[PDB]
Amino acid sequence: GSHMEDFVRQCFNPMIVELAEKAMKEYGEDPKIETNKFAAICTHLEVCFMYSDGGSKHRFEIIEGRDRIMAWTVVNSICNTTGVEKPKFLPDLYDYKENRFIEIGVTRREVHIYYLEKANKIKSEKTHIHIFSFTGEEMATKADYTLDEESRARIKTRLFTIRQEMASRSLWDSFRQSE
Ligand SMILES: O=C1c2c(O)c(=O)ccn2N([C@@H]2c3ccccc3SCc3c2ccc(F)c3F)[C@@H]2COCCN12
Ligand SMILES: [Mn+2]
Numbered sequence: 001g002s003h004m005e006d007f008v009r010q011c012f013n014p015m016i017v018e019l020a021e022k023a024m025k026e027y028g029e030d031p032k033i034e035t036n037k038f039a040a041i042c043t044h045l046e047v048c049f050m051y052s053d054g055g056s057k058h059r060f061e062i063i064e065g066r067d068r069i070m071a072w073t074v075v076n077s078i079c080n081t082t083g084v085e086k087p088k089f090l091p092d093l094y095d096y097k098e099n100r101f102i103e104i105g106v107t108r109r110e111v112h113i114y115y116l117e118k119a120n121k122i123k124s125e126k127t128h129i130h131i132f133s134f135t136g137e138e139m140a141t142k143a144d145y146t147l148d149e150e151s152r153a154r155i156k157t158r159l160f161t162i163r164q165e166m167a168s169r170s171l172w173d174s175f176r177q178s179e
């Protein structure tokens with residue numbers, strides 16, 4: 001048992017920890033060994049849920065936090081009913097108001113370089129990209145940040161609090177140096 005596994009369980013709420021475990025077992029990874037990945041999946045889930053909380057009610061379809069098959073099922077219903085092209089890789093949300101999928105990224109590095117890697121990867125110019133960093137930076141496709149800024153600020157504050165919490169336990173260095 002890691003310091004990291006225990007920290008994750010006292011830092012994140014039980015719903016999120018549970019969903020992260022579901023996700024790792026969907027891909028055959030073990031939360032007890034891949035413990036930095038565990039912390040990151042938890043962090044990304046919380047950010048995604050905080051993000052969907054920022055819109056008006058009914059604004060977002062949440063695709064993250066579902067098992068692989070149901071996630072693609074919801075993407076299919078979105079595509080077959082809005083006419084949007086079906087992405088090749090699973091996004092995180094769908095914006096009913098702007099009518100585009102969103103890929104949310106959380107990075108230990110500089111937002112620029114993770115954004116490039118995502119934009120490279122998806123190869124689908126239709127999926128809007130929004131990166132957050134553990135230093136309070138963000139980067140969104142076409143400089144369009146989707147949410148108004150109080151909702152993005154909460155995410156950035158929470159990310160930095162996780163960073164401090166990890167650091168107070170000397171977990172932070174090992175966490176950064178695993179991307
Ligand atoms: O949806 C995601 C995903 C993202 O949306 C993302 O932004 C980064 C990374 N992702 N992935 C996450 C994930 C999410 C957040 C932080 C780290 C990881 S690391 C890979 C991994 C994921 C989930 C379970 C697992 F066992 C993994 F090894 C996989 C990529 O295949 C599509 C689904 N998924
Ligand atoms: Mn995802």
Ligand SMILES: [Mn+2]
Nearest residue numbers: 092103104105
């Ligand atoms: Mn994501």
